[PDB]
Each structure stands twice: as structure tokens, then as C-alpha cells.
Symmetry: D2
């Protein structure tokens, strides 16, 4: 839908993952992030950024589905360099 | 050689890249970083971390050799998530 | 839809790419392949195979959209090792 | 050393892997292949081809070192699309 609202969803749920205790909290937070990226996926270049982000989130869901909470949390932190790469280029 | 001294080399040269103006400054700083990672490349796991870092630095040298200073600087910032992944795991 | 019919679509269109002359022939053939893989994307493991294939086809569409017919043809041949990896494992 | 002799080493040892029974046969064959690629690593482009091949062989050694003979054999077959990509371009 809206771009600013997609960024809010991504930024807010990333903290929910950082503060999560179990796999169900992580698995749900990533599902909202995946939906916000695919929704933003709509010069590009810019659009391929969101394609990369969808992939990384997707691989983190496997970890959460297997019960690997610690590694799912580790994988979510590596997303930040995709986030920053866009900002550093298109801002 | 020593591990603490390899980390100093990596951390100091990363800033030299951030503050660089031309390609020759970036190209030289990455060459010292590549040498410090390969030197540290000597459970692992831990050692594969340095293998990933060598690859990313290697691809950044192509950008600097082609005169792409801005993108070489962008590529150097993406290294940080490799740096942090080790620290978050083995510390 | 059906699995055997998805494999036919993939195998037939891959030859259409190999025999293609212009970008419009390649771009259209990849679009049918992408649809057949995403359709087959429905233990896994097995299912992640189709996720990898979707990504590789996706990157080949950029080449075809930029007019790079030769490289789009090169990228389509690298798909075959994904194809064979599944067969060698699950057959 | 010589290019034609490096290709012989790669092609011959690849079959030794395909016909291997235990991990020690696979682990040794990959070690000769890794040496032949790094030796050939000496426009490029062409040279980056050998850089990619070194990486893939390197990851296959982990599998062989962990006793995963079947997957090490699978990983060795995926090398062929790197082999063919060079030939299709520079021949
Ligand atoms: C990945 C995990 C993230 C996170 C957490 C954020 N982004 Fe982006 N972002 C992009 C652009 C062009 C802007 C500016 C336009 C706008 O204001 O929406 C932003 C902005 C943000 C914000 C600030 C929004 C605000 O309230 O003012 C935040 C918090 C934010 N981002 C977080 C562009 C991109 C990308 C382009 C390819 C990618 C990828 C990301 N952002 C990824 C992320
Ligand atoms: C990549 C670009 C980097 C950078 C800039 C740094 N590291 Fe590491 N690091 C690792 C470990 C186990 C330690 C603790 C042991 C030690 O003290 O040497 C560190 C420590 C550091 C420091 C602090 C050193 C000090 O003076 O006390 C700094 C500044 C530093 N690192 C920077 C382990 C790893 C890795 C393991 C796989 C990887 C990769 C990195 N570090 C990468 C980086
Ligand atoms: C990628 C480009 C390809 C291509 C060209 C093909 N495949 Fe597959 N495939 C898979 C399985 C389990 C089967 C057996 C089940 C079945 O018969 O459908 C196949 C079979 C085929 C065929 C033969 C179909 C027939 O008519 O009998 C062909 C021509 C074929 N494939 C082409 C499984 C997979 C995968 C699993 C992850 C992947 C990926 C692919 N195949 C990819 C490809
Ligand atoms: C990866 C696993 C492989 C394997 C098994 C082979 N290659 Fe290459 N190759 C390249 C070039 C330019 C040539 C022609 C020059 C020459 O004759 O040496 C070749 C040739 C071969 C041969 C034939 C050699 C002969 O006896 O005439 C064979 C058997 C062979 N290759 C196997 C270039 C490249 C690459 C460039 C980047 C890469 C990568 C590979 N080859 C990889 C492989
Ligand atoms: Ca806001
Ligand atoms: Ca809001
Ligand atoms: Ca808002
Ligand atoms: Ca909590
Ligand atoms: Ca992908
Ligand atoms: Ca110190
Ligand atoms: Ca010092
Ligand atoms: Ca010191
Ligand atoms: Ca300066
Ligand atoms: Ca059939
Ligand atoms: Ca049919
Ligand atoms: Ca049929
Ligand atoms: Ca034709
Ligand atoms: Ca010969
Ligand atoms: Ca010989
Ligand atoms: Ca010879
Ligand atoms: Ca045998
Ligand atoms: Ca590598
Ligand atoms: Zn894209
Ligand atoms: Zn980890
Ligand atoms: Zn390694
Ligand atoms: Zn950039
Ligand atoms: Zn998957
Ligand atoms: Zn090519
Ligand atoms: Zn290279
Ligand atoms: Zn396998």
C-alpha cells in the first residue's frame, strides 16, 4: 500500500524479533515483514532492493519453523545492511 | 599474526575507506583488510567467517579498480553485518 | 497445477530460449517458466528447490529486459544444475 | 602452471569424485582440483571464473570433511555449469 507505512511495519517488527523469546513470536513478526516488502515491491534497481529483502526474510522463516530462535534472530540483523544500502543510495 | 591486531587493521582501514576521496585510497585500504582477514584465517564455523569476509572484500576491489568509488564505499558498509554476526555469536 | 505438466513447460521453453534470436522470444519463454515453477511451488527441501529456480529465472528476465540476449541465454543454461540436483536427489 | 594441464586435472578428478566410494577419495580429489584452479588463477572476467570455481570447491570440502559423501558428490556436479559458462563465452 503506502511506502511510509511499509517502512513502519518493517522497523517495528524487527524490534519485536530482537525482543522475542520463543519461535512463534519470531515466526509471526517475519510474516508481517515479508508482506510489507512484497507490498512495497510495486530506476529499479530500487525495486530489486525489495526482491533481495524478500529472499533474506524467507530464509529466516525456515530457521524459525525449525525452532532455531537464536539463528533466526541473527539472520534478522543481517537484513539491516540491505535496509542501509537503499537509504545510503536513494536518500 | 595476532588476532587483536588483525581486528585493529580491519576497523581502522574501514574508516579510511569511509573518509576516502579517490579510488587509490579505497583500493589500498581494502588490500590491507584482505591481508588481515587471510592472516586471521588460521569450531570453524569461526574460520568460515573469515572466508566470507575475504570474498566480500575481493568483490569490492573490482569496484575500486574500475573507478567506482561510491559503490566501493557502499560495498564496504555491507561487510559490517559479517563483523557483527561473529561478535553476536562468539562473544 | 499438475507436476508432470509443469516439467513439460520448463523443458520445452528452455529449448525455445536456446533457439531464440531476439529478446522478445527469450523474455516470453522465461515468463512461462517462472509461472510453471511458482505453480509447482505447492520434505521440502523439495519445495525450496523451486524457490531457487524462481530466483534464477527472475535474474534472467532483467538481462532479457535490458536487451542482453546472449547473457540471458547463458543464464538459462545455469538453471540446468538446479534441475539435475533435484533429479539426482529425489529419483 | 600450464592451462591445458590444469583442465586435465579438473576433468580427470571430477570423474574420480563421481566414482568415489568413501570420503577420503572425494576429499583428496577436490584438493587437487582446488590447486589446479588457484594455479590457473594467474579480460578477467575470465579470471573471476576461476575465483567462483575455487569457492564452490571449497564448500564441497566441508561436506567431505563432515563425512557427507553423497552431498559432496552432488556439489561437484553443480561445478559443471561454471565450467560450461566459460567455454560457451570464451570459445
Ligand atoms: C529493512 C529492514 C528496512 C527498514 C527497517 C527500513 N527500511 Fe526504508 N526507506 C526507503 C526510502 C526511500 C525511505 C524514504 C521514504 C519514506 O520516508 O518512506 C525509507 C524510509 C525508512 C524509514 C523512515 C520512514 C519515516 O517514517 O519517515 C524507516 C524507519 C525505514 N525506512 C526502515 C527505502 C528502502 C529500501 C529501498 C530499496 C529498502 C530495502 C528499505 N528502505 C529497507 C528498510
Ligand atoms: C569486520 C569488518 C570486522 C571488524 C571491523 C572487527 N571485527 Fe572482530 N572480533 C572477533 C572476536 C572473537 C573478537 C574478540 C577477540 C579480540 O579481542 O580480538 C573481535 C574483536 C574485535 C574488536 C575489538 C578488539 C579489541 O581491541 O579489543 C574489533 C574492533 C573488531 N573485532 C573489529 C571475531 C570476528 C570475526 C569472526 C568470525 C569476524 C568476521 C570479525 N571479528 C570481523 C570484524
Ligand atoms: C529445470 C529447468 C527443470 C527441467 C527442465 C525439468 N525439471 Fe524436473 N522433475 C522433478 C521430479 C520429482 C520429476 C519426476 C516426477 C515427474 O515425472 O513429473 C521430474 C521430472 C522431470 C521431467 C520428466 C517428466 C516426464 O514427462 O516424465 C522433465 C522433462 C523435467 N523434470 C524437466 C523434480 C524437479 C525439481 C525438484 C526440486 C526441480 C527443481 C526440477 N525438477 C527442475 C526441472
Ligand atoms: C570445471 C570443472 C572445468 C572442467 C572440467 C574443464 N574446464 Fe575448461 N577450458 C577453458 C578454456 C579457455 C579452454 C580452452 C583452452 C585449452 O584448450 O586449454 C578450456 C578447455 C578445457 C578442456 C579441453 C582441454 C584440451 O585438452 O583441449 C577441458 C577438458 C576442460 N576445459 C575442462 C576455460 C575454462 C574456464 C574459464 C573461466 C573455466 C572456469 C573452466 N574452463 C572450467 C573447466
Ligand atoms: Ca512515519
Ligand atoms: Ca504507523
Ligand atoms: Ca505512518
Ligand atoms: Ca521479551
Ligand atoms: Ca531469491
Ligand atoms: Ca586493542
Ligand atoms: Ca595497534
Ligand atoms: Ca594492539
Ligand atoms: Ca577525506
Ligand atoms: Ca509427459
Ligand atoms: Ca504436454
Ligand atoms: Ca503431459
Ligand atoms: Ca531460431
Ligand atoms: Ca590435452
Ligand atoms: Ca595430461
Ligand atoms: Ca596435456
Ligand atoms: Ca568406485
Ligand atoms: Ca568466495
Ligand atoms: Zn528484481
Ligand atoms: Zn549465527
Ligand atoms: Zn570455509
Ligand atoms: Zn550502491
Ligand atoms: Zn524455501
Ligand atoms: Zn556469460
Ligand atoms: Zn575476481
Ligand atoms: Zn543434494
Amino acid at each position: 500500500a503506502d511506502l511510509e507505512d511499509n517502512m513502519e511495519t518493517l522497523n517495528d517488527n524487527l524490534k519485536v524479533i530482537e525482543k522475542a523469546d520463543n519461535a512463534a513470536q519470531v515466526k509471526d513478526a517475519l510474516t508481517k515483514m515479508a508482506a510489507a516488502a512484497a507490498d512495497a515491491w510495486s530506476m529499479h534497481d530500487f525495486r530489486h532492493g525489495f526482491w533481495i529483502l524478500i529472499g533474506q526474510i524467507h530464509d529466516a522463516l525456515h530457521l524459525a519453523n525449525e525452532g532455531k530462535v537464536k539463528e533466526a534472530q541473527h539472520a534478522a540483523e543481517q537484513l539491516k545492511c540491505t535496509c542501509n544500502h537503499c537509504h545510503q543510495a536513494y536518500r
